[PDB]
Amino acid sequence: MLVFIDDGSTNIKLQWQESDGTIKQHISPNSFKREWAVSFGDKKVFNYTLNGEQYSFDPISPDAVVTTNIAWQYSDVNVVAVHHALLTSGLPVSEVDIVCTLPLTEYYDRNNQPNTENIERKKANFRKKITLNGGDTFTIKDVKVMPESIPAGYEVLQELDELDSLLIIDLGGTTLDISQVMGKLSGISKIYGDSSLGVSLVTSAVKDALSLARTKGSSYLADDIIIHRKDNNYLKQRINDENKISIVTEAMNEALRKLEQRVLNTLNEFSGYTHVMVIGGGAELICDAVKKHTQIRDERFFKTNNSQYDLVNGMYLIGN
Template sequence: MRIYVDDGSTNIKLAWKDNGEVKTFISPNSFKPEWSLNLFSDQISANYEIEGEKFSFDPGSVDAVVTTETRYQYSLVNTVAIHHALLHSGIKPQDIDVVVTLPLSEYLDSDFQPKTENITRKKNSVKRIVSLQGNKSGFSIGKVSVLPESIPAGFNVLTGLEDDDSLLIVDLGGTTLDVSHVRSKMSGITNTWCDPKIGVSIITNDIKNVLASYTRISSLQADKMIINRDENGWLEHRLPDAEMRTQVINAIEAKKKLLVNRVLNVIDRFNGYTHIMCVGGGAKLIAEDIQKNTNIPAARFYTSDNPQFDLVLGMLEMKEGSSNG
């Protein structure tokens, strides 16, 4: 069985085929560097060990291991996070092959050629054995393939473009902005740009800062505030204090503007594209402004209902043919 893993810095996204049907799963990266006491015996343990180091999944931990840095891509906690996602995906533990991702800057050199040493490093990193509370994890990873971030997300759109057309794929994740300008039918890469400092974490960190004088919250909790910012009553319930709430809402708005400007500055480096696609968890925060500012007609602008899964679904389509097949 082959499982597609977009192992982003804030969330692991999985996609696989089950009897021809495409399934997906998402698992947040929130691990602390020690084991937790499991009070509920009916729950799967989330205490892991890798190369003598212990980690446990803890969604509320304010001391969660920082995963929003490039070196996370090859870290012990990344391998643990992949196993954790697999163990909670509903897939029966078994021997599997995986396809994982690296940010564009790690994957491609300045001539747009794969950086083989990084790809090998990533493969070796993912193959490390993870044990679950003293036992083997249950998933044994055999073959590992590595794909670049952003590019595979455009697979379907690129397949349908005319020969002279090209697509700008803008992937805004938790930490990184990956932009690639790809020619139709994936016939070539015109240009790419990766900024590991532009991501939704600009907003996440500001929410944490704003709240720091009242309380400490985890990145995962701050992310939930961003995601649910427009849900009626959601923020009121989490932040009953009106003053605190206003500060959080203002922080989200201000940093969202900053994020949009930073993304637009990067897009300014590109020219000649005929279509744009916006993917990644941050797509919903920026898509409207990007379309407006680039003057790309609506019919040539793509953003899906669930942009966080576009990359992993594109990886699956690229390797296995269309999702119906």
């Protein structure tokens, strides 16, 4: 069994192909604590032992998900989170070969060449043996690693000429990933990552202009205000105050301009691309500005955003 794994900063997504031919997907949390979870036998608990330390699944509010850092990708918890996903996936316990991920700037070095040191370190991490109290665990055999953003653009790359060059612009909640890839994924010419640029720049500007609480509830409100920014009636309906509307609107417009400018300034470091692709949760917010700035023709511009499984699905298409 070959399992494709998107072990990102907020959760674990799996994709694999069953005996017949059906493609299955699964998502699991990244919430684990460094201690034994006790049960009086009333609720289900997962107690693990990895290198020496013990760990347990720590179920928390789907509203308090913690975003992890780069170092997390080489930790014990990373390994436990993957094994836990396999255990709750539905797959039968067994030996499995896997493909996991490393962030763009971790997979590649500043010379745009694959950083062998990091990749090998990622692979060695899954060699640690794991046990589960009260049951058995999967056994990870072969481990391959893929960079994060690029697989999401494979479907498009597949139809490009190897001499063609695709500029993949991936704007997320808190980060920006840009990479120039040769047609059919026949090579990489340049990679660029910014960890302080994302949709949050606009979201925080909105939360601040409304004095919204820190609750995730205000996050949804802010998300909605951004989504429906051009529909003044939607807003009047939401924010009850013509004055608040004007205030939130210009704070939002100001934040978006700064967003567009910062993204374009980074794009100014790339050159030689023939096709452009914009993806990520913030794709809608910069779509127009990049199209105008790159002056690329419509048949050479792509917006393949579909779902949260885009990445792992792309990984699947590449190495199924």
